[PDB]
Design a protein around this ligand. Structure first.
Ligand SMILES: *C(=O)N1C[C@H](NOS(=O)(=O)O)CC[C@H]1C(N)=O
Length: 250
């Protein structure tokens, strides 16, 4: 367990990072207090909800559709019968809400418990309805479910090292749709962004969670901002993550 200083890559944004290599148990932690603090996962939950949907047969491949019904949305790419792969990369909320609402709560509770997914609290299934967004809400979006960056890395490691009961076929679908182009062919990077705003504390929940493969070694990582500047989003934290990977993990 090494405490490290990645602050230069954060360019003044408040946050932390944790990288974990489970072969030689090298835990690299920037901002330990924040890395141990549970927060809403926001759209990073799509990593797990994809696996739930595959396991329950709601979806079956990276092509699978959820029966688009024609509802109008401001994002162009939500207005179509998009595949799993496209809905994951577009972070399409209606697709993943319809997916999870096909699964019974007991099944989800038991999967989260098995994964040790933070507080495993799905009590507010419908999500943060006070924000006015209605069905564009759920327990994983600034609501009851909370997970720390350290727990995110532990969950990613358990899934992608083959230590859960999820089918290998399903884990490989997730790897495929999580793959990121970082303009460096000598590392494979996978992950998912998440963006929320914590109204109580007036801070963002901006995430990038995933894994890095670099010649034999695999690192599981979670990068998280809690800045008060509302302009700090998941995509911005992903930029910071890539700069950390290129500086310190090449
Ligand atoms: C998930 O965090 N969300 C869905 C969507 N994607 O965000 S991301 O670019 O950080 O992955 C928009 C924001 C958020 C939401 N409001 O539901």
């Amino acid at each position: 367990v090494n405490i490290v200083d990645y602050s230069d890559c954060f360019e003044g944004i408040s946050g932390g990072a944790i990288f974990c290599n489970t072969k030689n148990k090298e835990y690299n932690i920037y901002n330990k207090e924040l890395i141990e603090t549970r927060r809403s996962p926001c759209s990073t939950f799509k990593i797990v909800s994809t696996l739930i949907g595959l396991e329950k047969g709601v979806i079956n491949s990276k092509e699978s559709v959820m029966g688009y019904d024609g509802t109008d949305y401001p994002n162009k790419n939500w207005n179509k019968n998009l595949s799993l792969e496209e809905a994951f990369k577009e972070s399409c909320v209606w697709y993943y809400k319809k997916l999870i609402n096909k699964v019974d709560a007991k099944s989800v509770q038991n999967i989260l418990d098995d994964l040790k997914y933070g507080n495993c609290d799905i009590s507010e299934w419908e999500g943060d309805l006070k924000n006015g967004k209605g069905h564009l809400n759920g327990f994983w979006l600034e609501s009851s479910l909370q997970i720390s960056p350290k727990e995110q890395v532990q969950t990613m490691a358990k899934i992608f090292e083959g230590d859960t009961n999820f089918k290998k076929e399903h884990i490989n679908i997730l790897r495929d749709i999580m793959a990121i182009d970082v303009n460096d062919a000598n590392i494979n990077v996978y992950g998912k962004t998440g963006t929320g705003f914590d109204e109580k504390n007036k801070r963002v929940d901006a995430w990038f969670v995933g894994m890095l493969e670099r010649e034999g070694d695999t690192y599981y990582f979670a990068i998280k901002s809690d800045d008060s500047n509302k302009e700090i989003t998941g995509p911005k934290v992903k930029e910071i993550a890539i700069n950390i990977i290129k500086k310190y993990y090449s």
